[PDB]
Design a protein around this ligand. Sequence first.
Ligand SMILES: O=C(O)Cc1c[nH]c2ccccc12
Ligand SMILES: O=C(O)Cc1c[nH]c2ccccc12
Lengths: 400, 399, 397, 398, 396
Amino acid sequence: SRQSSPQSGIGECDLQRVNPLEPAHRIQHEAGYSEIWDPTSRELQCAGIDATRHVIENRGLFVPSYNNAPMLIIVVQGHGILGAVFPGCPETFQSFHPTDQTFRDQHQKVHFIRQGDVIALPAGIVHWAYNEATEKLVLLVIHDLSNRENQLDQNLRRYFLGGNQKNLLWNNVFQPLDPQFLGRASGVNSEIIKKLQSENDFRGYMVRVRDGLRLVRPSSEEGYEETLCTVRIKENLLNPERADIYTSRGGTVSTLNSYNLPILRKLQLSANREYLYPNAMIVPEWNNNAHSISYVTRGSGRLQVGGSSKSTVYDGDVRQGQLFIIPQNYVYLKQAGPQGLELYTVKTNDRAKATALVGRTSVIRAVPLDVWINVFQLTQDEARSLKYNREEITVLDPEL
Amino acid sequence: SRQSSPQSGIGECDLQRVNPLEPAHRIQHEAGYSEIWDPTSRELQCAGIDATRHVIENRGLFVPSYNNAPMLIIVVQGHGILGAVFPGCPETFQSFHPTDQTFRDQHQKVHFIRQGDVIALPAGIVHWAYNEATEKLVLLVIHDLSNRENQLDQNLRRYFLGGNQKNLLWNNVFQPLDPQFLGRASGVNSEIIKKLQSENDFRGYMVRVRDGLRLVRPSSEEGYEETLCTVRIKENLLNPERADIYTSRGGTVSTLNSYNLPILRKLQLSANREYLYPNAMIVPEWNNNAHSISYVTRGSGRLQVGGSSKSTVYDGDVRQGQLFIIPQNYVYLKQAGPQGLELYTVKTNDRAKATALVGRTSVIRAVPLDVWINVFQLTQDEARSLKYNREEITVLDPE
Amino acid sequence: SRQSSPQSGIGECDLQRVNPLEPAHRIQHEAGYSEIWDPTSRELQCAGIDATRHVIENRGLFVPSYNNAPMLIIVVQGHGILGAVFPGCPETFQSFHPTTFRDQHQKVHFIRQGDVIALPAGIVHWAYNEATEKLVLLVIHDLSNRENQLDQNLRRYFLGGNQKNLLWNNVFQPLDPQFLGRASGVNSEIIKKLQSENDFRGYMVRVRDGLRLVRPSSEEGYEETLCTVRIKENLLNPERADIYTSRGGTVSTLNSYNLPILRKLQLSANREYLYPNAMIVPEWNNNAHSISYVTRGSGRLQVGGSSKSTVYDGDVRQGQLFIIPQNYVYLKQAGPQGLELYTVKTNDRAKATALVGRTSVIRAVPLDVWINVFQLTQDEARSLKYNREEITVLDPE
Amino acid sequence: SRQSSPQSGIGECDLQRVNPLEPAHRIQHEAGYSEIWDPTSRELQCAGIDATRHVIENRGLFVPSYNNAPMLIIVVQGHGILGAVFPGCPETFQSFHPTTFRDQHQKVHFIRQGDVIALPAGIVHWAYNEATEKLVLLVIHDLSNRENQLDQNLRRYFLGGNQKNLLWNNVFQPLDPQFLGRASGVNSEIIKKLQSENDFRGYMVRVRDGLRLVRPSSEEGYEETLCTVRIKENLLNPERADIYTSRGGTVSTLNSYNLPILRKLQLSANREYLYPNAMIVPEWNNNAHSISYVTRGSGRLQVGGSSKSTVYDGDVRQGQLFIIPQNYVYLKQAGPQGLELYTVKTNDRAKATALVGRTSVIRAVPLDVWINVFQLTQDEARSLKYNREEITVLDPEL
Amino acid sequence: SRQSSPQSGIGECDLQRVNPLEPAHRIQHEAGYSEIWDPTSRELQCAGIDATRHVIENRGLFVPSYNNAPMLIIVVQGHGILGAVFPGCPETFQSFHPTTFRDQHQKVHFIRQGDVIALPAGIVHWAYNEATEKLVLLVIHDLSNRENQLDQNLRRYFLGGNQKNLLWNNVFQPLDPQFLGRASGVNSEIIKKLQSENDFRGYMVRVRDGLRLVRPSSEGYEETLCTVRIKENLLNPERADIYTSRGGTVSTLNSYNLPILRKLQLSANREYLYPNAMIVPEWNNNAHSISYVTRGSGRLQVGGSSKSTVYDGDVRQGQLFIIPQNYVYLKQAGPQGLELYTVKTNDRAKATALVGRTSVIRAVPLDVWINVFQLTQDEARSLKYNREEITVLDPE
Ligand SMILES: O=C(O)Cc1c[nH]c2ccccc12
Ligand SMILES: O=C(O)Cc1c[nH]c2ccccc12
């Protein structure tokens, strides 16, 4: 129901330690593989999320599926096509030729995805993906299990329209049905339905399309179908020109919330891309209204996290390919190593905001100097230095 | 609190089986009876609902009560009068005559209910019902326990203003109170209060009104009181003319959501009525954003449900009087038997939507042909058959 | 996550007993103390709240902190200053002389007895007692609030402080002073002072010569809107009454039609003042739990629940907290000194349903329903409707 | 544009007189007629409305059309079929047999006396009368609505029709038949039929053989939500009453707490039924103009405005329209045959303020204010507050 | 005030004719020029809009200004940098070296051909051309918008500038320099530079060796409301929302795409038609349409309230045309195709089709049209079904 809770330490988010995490299981398909982070880790259970890394080979088709939880998809590498189906919307990508005959077809709009895209999809919505590039298409999918859109319980379901094998709730939805019953409903013979059920077809859930996928797509140009049915699903965060915060020699923050992408308001999710130059820092801070789930796409650095105890919750490296969860209100500091550091972060609220302890937007600045003089037993000059020594907002220059 | 959960990889809604459910327990009153579905069934626990079927006889008055959860009430049979009390609104049903005398009275608006009506009531609202007719008035009540309006825990409370019993949380709220204390508050003798407590009453919670209930109701015509206090509480779904989908020879769907009945937006519920002619079907589909709770009011059919396992969750018949629950995102197929099939369904969201696997609105059409060719290993002809063979939306013609 | 439940059919709110509660644990600081109600009590876990009574001595400073749950704060006694920081807003209380009165900071709030202050989760707040009498704050944290995505336990995360299972901590302590120093651009020895290790004054510190801040003197863009949100309203003046019955008393309600921030927080409050022997009509809360604190006097409280047996029937008095869950019927009568209560309710626009008086459910139902249900005569059923002509506050005559 | 104003204090609503009005022009069609109230009357200009009475005879089809202003349609008499088209919604009334009963189209609505129907600007609608008695539609268009970005004049754009300054036109006529034919994929002589070349039936045509529609038979995605929006509600049954005073009569209110589309449209309505000699309490509309149509009976209406002299004190009777602007005080009493009124108000959640009865402003103000303002005794002031125990509808024998 | 009306049965939008329009006036600057469409034209007064085309030369800086009306800006050609200031937001583009490379300013936006930028009334904005080719901005100001509480005329208030009936002014000129200097803490000689009264470069100035900005390069509320996206690019055929092979595309821009459009009550689209392709005949059900032809040409027919066509003729590159709410229209591309950018005066503006799968013809029962138009049943089926496209028609 709407009223759920995780499987399970005075409480499920009273974590004494957090660690960067790697995937715990790999599923092979014909045309790629899926790596799953352990859904039972305390970090993931506290954050209410699942995390998956799909790796789709060249000419690989990821079988359409729907989930019980909304998600953000980060395109980590590659480029391709994503489909998303809005039920009751007309098919507006149309070709009435020929009369390669598979070019005669009508379907819903398809989306051209590329590295740096963050794609937002509701629960219940069918989606699929196809890699048209030579390099692998790598999708990092964060499913928000605790979202109001999931009325089941705090476990991910993946319901596929097709597929078969080459504790997970992952299934071809046509399999548990009577093919004759489904056949009569669809107006097709039950042997067509047996092909939907994928009997004797063990390619997994990403299949190779040998000669390339044929679809209706716009060529070079050298009612509600216009509004609701056209909702923007993604935005690219990769261009440094898309930065919202920029400190020269320090790096960028590129935020993605419902002031940018409208569907995020319904989904109650946000994201960001942070790029740090070598040795640069993000100001120490906490998330005031959200958990943060970060994936390191490039580089490395040091992360320190503080919680409820006098002892540190984590103090160590993060590096490429790792995920890390920072719960709401835990304090954290990041510094890039010598190669820089690039992260994408999903946050469990729309309009997720952080509170800084350093810089022009700091809580230290906002409090009277004499409060800090008394609390910290500082002199006036020591407390001024605390307020004003860093003049940056959010992104710290390693050279100050 | 707001943060609750039921009694129940594995999860409370990870169901490998569902079955049609009949009531598990009957409570007999003087002027009718109440049948309760087992609240501990896995289906009900997952969907976060209770279900009750109240049968109110001729000249039967169902004692006023309030609950901790909002509800939809389906009028399965009969007709009668329903009261619902909005606190802080004035009494706008008014008679100043005479000077028999109980006709001199003021009370809030009463509602004239009939078969096919679906009535929506928030948590905490006092309501009551009466049957004027000779046929029984049958109300199917679906309480949404996981609703935000319920801050207590995932169990139904029934708090009656009167009544007496001769674990269910069903109680006459006056009984625990000190009658002297309540009488001093109310300005009445503590013996009137002991009549409110009804400690020696054997009639239960539906009482006979031998000579018929008298109230202030409009006669033949042959400020905030106009707006908030007037909120509409019901809509009738029975007329085929109220259909939103109609397929000749197949049947109708009549949907009830917040574009139809404004109070549903606040309650986060919606409802529909499906009528299938013999052997007709509703397209195979799943609910995107809600659980479904269906009650068979006439006829019979076959239902198949799929879930997360390669094996079916249910494949069998459904029959008049049975309740069945389909959780969010489970796929289901329905076909009417040889007498047709009528269902009313409550869904656990505002503007609940289904996604079809067949027909013009199908997800199959929406996806490029070549994806299906590749995924299912179909020919181009077979893929096109799959897209276009059924030209219906939602309700399938058996011919 | 967003989907949680307390450590608590036998639901967490199926309470066969309630009773008025006093705090169970006290924490001593240099400049006052903190009294905590037992967070494990069935009543508190049902209501989804934590309750704290902070007592701040003269010249005492309550170290800044933030929590995982929104709160209402009732100023039971005294007066003082309250800070609340909105991240990303500029410092608009400014002094540029001399060139610690040279400072810029956020707007500070002047608080006094009768104020109800509303703060979201995650916001840094602090408080200072200006007056000679103790400043007494009753804080109700709403743990089950949507703003709390962690679990159903309060975190108090302090910016400073140290000792003079609770999740109460100086957030600087678990960070590396050299790492935090580099980010802050200060020496690590300054960071060690933030960590307060060697400083054991607790979380309320004495300010010998009085706190110096930027405050407005006598006058004898987004900074103007979002950043200037109202955070409190005073409920004490009988003139702020919304319901008044002469010889009876007042109810002074605080909801989002009064204080806008309450809409986002999903909380409201009220102050009830009853003259000796007066009553609030019997009723139930139709969309909220109520958490009441008795600030003055005493009275009788009866609560009814799901059983034939009363859930409570007895005295309430000064200093006690009582919880009435959603839908439970209750009646209150003031004793011979009167009765003052402040109450917090777990909803935006919390509403009660009356069983007595001009807004009663009894009036709204047809007379012949009550005739038949209760086996009353017509005169008796009219008595029941009409004998009390008051709304909400009953006149002891 | 959005920023408009009428052709014509003394501002446009500083009205020294209001009168009940009758229609000023009749347009004859083949299969009925349309009666139009004078759009230049000061009352209609003030209220920002256009009022039309359409009379559709048996087997009369009112040609589909759309307007630049939203409307409330009151079914004064008869019953029939109404269609409204939501663009981009699928056709969910479907018949696949035989292999003009084989058709798909959008939902059609079965309309009857007492129905109030709400339609936005720009939506195509049409109606058909299958019954013996004439189908009588009173259409109130809200010209000043935000939905109308043109100017303060109604347009009536028909998809068909031709004559049997009003802006009333068959929209196909100003198009080039070759160009339109190419676009539609039909021969340009089919297009000439669309232009209703040589067809002079007006805008209600007779259906010689009766209309063949796909309509639900007896039962003895977005298409389910947005595309299903409720367009109407019946107000006629005394059981639907929101306010009832025995021997006095009823008020049945229609606003966005009842019919959700009204929120978007910023309109509301009500039906008032008064037994002989009964009254509606004197009052004013605090946030809307009122546009009332008398469907049955007769009565006395008095209106007060900004001057010492009454704005109107006189009879109203069946078939008359009367406009009461925002904040003008009014009182109504039924005649010896009772009085039935349907009223449109220019706001979502239109409310009135009562000078008499339990909801009155008199009750809300301290007694001593009225003692001092009116120079009454304490007893006279209590009489004023309390002599009428009714809310809104007054008992002629209280 | 909020209650206004344009300068001058009969009504301001009862148009018997519409025409494609070109600018009526050209204002030269040092580093570009501005072309203004006649604001008294019946079409523009009906639609409640002004239209301007600014052409900015290489290394030209368009002086910052603010207006009383919200606008959509179409980047017709070129690329550059646009600034927009949100008052009360912090400067988050920051350089602290050397110790004018050392500066802090608000975010700057990299604009390019195909971008549609949305700006509220009252917001200071400015633009600079990075490239060799001219930067060409087509600006549609929505005068009738609720954001304009003044009256139905555009004001252009510049922070600088001076000449090289329009309400176009350097806001510092009417101020006393001593008084403004005292407030600003600067000498009155700086304020006289602000006033620019002996500067004859106009409102677009040449920046000799490039503008020095803090901008990214080799790779609280400040993160939310201060970040609001102001633009979306419509040029890529892949951004298309409606696509008919051999016909063209429609790429729509409304508040389900770009959140700020909800507050502004505006939307836009780009239409690209292959040679001889059509958009289905239709009307705008809830807005006026203001179309600018960026490429190519075509035939446009418009119908209104009479039996006489309102317009039937060609539209060509560089021309603006207005279709009021509810007027019916048909468009066909000429032999080079047609590209249009359109601004519509509503949030979530929608059109109704007379042809194709979404048509009103399909939604109405067959027998209604059989009776209205005196068609055979086969004719009326042809009328519903002969075009199976939605919105964009295949010329074959
Ligand atoms: O109306 C039609 O003929 C096509 C159409 C419009 N909206 C639709 C949604 C789903 C499937 C088809 C359609
Ligand atoms: O812009 C500035 O220079 C100051 C400023 C404006 N808004 C702010 C928000 C937080 C901190 C500083 C500022």
